[PDB]
């Protein structure tokens, strides 16, 4: 279809969607964190901070932090066994308090993973995750927020790809998905930066000691050109990731302006024999560099099977206006 046909279908799929309740949740959680240790900062991150709007089927992410974690505003995050042990421990404690205060709520401590996390379902249309002692999640939400503030309307491209990636089964929330919603946001931003619709923000300029624990609403307008700006962006995104991004030689990166190579990171076939993450092999078929973590591939679950699926789906979106027409 034309940019206009695509832009118009997408805007109609979002007309139901356009229509600071977080504060009340924040406070309920801090009631709990204060019961463990009252000197503890509670910080919001996730899409609610990236977008500045609180979505539909959308939970909130919080992290617990010490005064001195917050002062070490640019400190990296230890991947040691000591580092995780410590965080699993403070979340044990906070989990016990949540449960004592709120009987209706399910509170699960997840252990299959790189990052300890406590997962809360209240049922009332209230879900959230609490992590502990980590700055990179508030850091990278703040950076993608920086980027979307440059250009408020660009969030419609972002949101359109988020929803599609769940519809196609590519998204890591779905069984058999390989890139998280977070990884797709790195891709959209990377794309936008290569078209010159955003000026580069170096990742080291983001300081946790300077971010608002619960940041302001960034209002979302309806596209006023009937979605022409939008369907042109969608169609371009997909062209760029199909016939412009060289997945065999290049890495999707936000650490640098310009191209990053698989070769300069040692993100090669040889390296797949030696790289492991969660007692499992890491794949360097579709390479996405985390801005803050050491030598972390966000597309590390994109096996050669899943790299094929992604091409296939990027082609189908060209015709169906991201599965809307
Ligand atoms: O691979 C990831 C995935 C998520 N994130 C951060 O967590 C935020 C919300 O992620 P969500 O996928 O809703 O829930 C996550 C987070 O609460 C937590 N998490 C996971 C990975 C991580 O690096 N940091 C982190 O806090 O684990 C859960 C299961 O993936 C994103 O916006 C990112 O800033 C990442 O930094 N890396
Ligand atoms: Cl193309
Ligand atoms: Mg979450």
Swiss-Prot record:
The record ties this protein, via InterPro entries, to: MTPAP-like_central (IPR054708), NT_sf (IPR043519), PAP_assoc (IPR002058)
What result is annotated for mutating residue 114 to F? Answer: Loss of catalytic activity
Question: What does the UniProt record report as the effect of altering residue 129 to A in this chain?
Answer: Loss of catalytic activity. Does not affect UTP binding
Recorded GO cellular component terms are: kinetoplast; mitochondrion
Cofactors demanded by this protein: Mg(2+); Mn(2+)
Q: Does the keyword Transferase apply?
A: yes
Into which EC class is this enzyme placed? Answer: transferase
> Which keywords appear in this protein's UniProt record, sorted alphabetically?
Magnesium, Manganese, Metal-binding, Nucleotide-binding, Nucleotidyltransferase, RNA-binding, Transferase
Residues reported in the UniProt entry to bind UTP: 47, 58-61, 137-141, 162, 166, 181-182
Can you give the residue ranges of the PAP-associated domain? 230-295
Site positions for Important for catalytic activity: 129
Q: Is this entry keyworded Cell membrane?
A: no
**What GO biological process terms does the UniProt entry carry, in alphabetical order?**
RNA 3'-end processing
Q: Anything known on activity regulation? A: The 3' uridylated RNA substrate is involved in the selective incorporation of UTP; UTP binding is favored due to the constraint posed on the positioning of the NTP base by the continuous stacking interactions between Tyr-182 side chain, the bound NTP, and the terminal nucleoside base of the RNA substrate.
The family this protein is said to belong to: Belongs to the DNA polymerase type-B-like family.
Q: What is this protein called?
A: Terminal uridylyltransferase 4
């Amino acid at each position: 279809p034309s940019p206009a046909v695509v832009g118009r279908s997408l805007v109609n799929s979002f007309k139901q969607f356009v229509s600071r309740h977080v504060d009340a949740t924040y406070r309920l959680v801090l009631d709990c964190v204060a019961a463990v240790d009252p000197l503890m900062r509670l910080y919001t991150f996730g899409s609610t901070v990236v977008y500045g709007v609180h979505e539909k089927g959308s939970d909130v992410d919080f992290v617990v932090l010490n005064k001195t974690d917050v002062e070490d505003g640019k400190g990296g995050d230890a991947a040691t066994q000591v580092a995780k042990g410590l965080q699993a421990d403070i979340l044990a404690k906070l989990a016990r308090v949540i449960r004592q205060k709120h009987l209706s709520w399910n509170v699960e401590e997840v252990r299959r993973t790189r990052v300890p996390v406590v997962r809360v379902k209240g049922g009332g249309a209230v879900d959230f995750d609490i992590t502990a002692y980590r700055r990179n999640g508030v850091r990278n939400s703040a950076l993608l927020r920086a980027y979307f503030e440059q250009n408020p309307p660009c969030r419609w491209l972002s949101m359109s790809i988020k929803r599609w990636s769940k519809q196609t089964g590519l998204n890591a929330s779905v069984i058999g998905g390989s890139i998280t919603s977070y990884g797709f946001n790195l891709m959209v931003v990377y794309y936008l930066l290569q078209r010159n619709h955003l000026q580069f923000v170096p990742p080291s300029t983001i300081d946790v000691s300077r971010v608002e624990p619960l940041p302001p609403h960034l209002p979302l307008e309806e596209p006023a050109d009937e979605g022409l700006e939008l369907g042109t962006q969608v169609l371009d995104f997909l062209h760029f990731f199909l016939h412009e991004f060289d997945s065999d030689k290049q890495v999707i990166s936000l650490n640098r302006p310009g191209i990053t190579t698989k070769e300069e990171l040692d993100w090669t076939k040889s390296a797949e024999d030696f790289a492991r993450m969660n007692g499992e092999k890491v794949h360097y078929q579709w390479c996405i560099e985390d801005p803050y973590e050491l030598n972390l591939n966000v597309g590390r679950n994109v096996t050669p099977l899943k790299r094929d699926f992604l091409r296939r789906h990027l082609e189908k979106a060209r015709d169906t206006a991201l599965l809307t027409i």
